[PDB]
Design a protein around this nucleic acid. Structure first.
Length: 68
RNA sequence: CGUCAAAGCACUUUGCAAAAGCUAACGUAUCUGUUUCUUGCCUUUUACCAGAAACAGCCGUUUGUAAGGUGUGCUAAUUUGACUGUAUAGUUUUUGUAAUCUUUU
């Protein structure tokens, strides 16, 4: 990251780890390889909330865009 | 070559499915891109240098199956499978040593 890693979230169902920040960046750190796989581009500004839905493979994040 | 069974037949157009099952060229061919890292040449970013790992596209190949098209036959031809497939009256099996009678329990 380039600016304070705000969020984090490990998923239990997949060996992934997530992160967020004041970069607009949302990442998918694969835990088996220990590198990033996916960016989730779309957020207009610094993201704070990072939380992983329990059933459905789905990811929720929110920040100052004033939107989840 | 011979029998039996199945089926139109050869050639072709599309659709739809698949293509490491026990280490192996689906392609004796071979190109671009994204991300993550490492080094080059550099300060405008792009455009690039040349290595890695992870993903992707693209140009092609094979198979099965479905419907079609052309030419030929449906009073035929071709394909496909399957099979415990040969002929011997003269000594080891399919051209007879068989026939017949009687006693014992």
């Amino acid at each position: 990251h380039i600016a304070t890693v705000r969020g984090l979230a490990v998923s239990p169902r997949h060996p992934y780890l997530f992160s967020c920040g004041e970069d607009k960046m949302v990442k998918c750190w694969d835990l088996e390889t220990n590198k990033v796989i996916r960016h989730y581009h779309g957020h207009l500004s610094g993201v704070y909330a990072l939380k992983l839905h329990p059933t459905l493979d789905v990811l929720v994040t929110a920040g100052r865009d004033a939107v989840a």
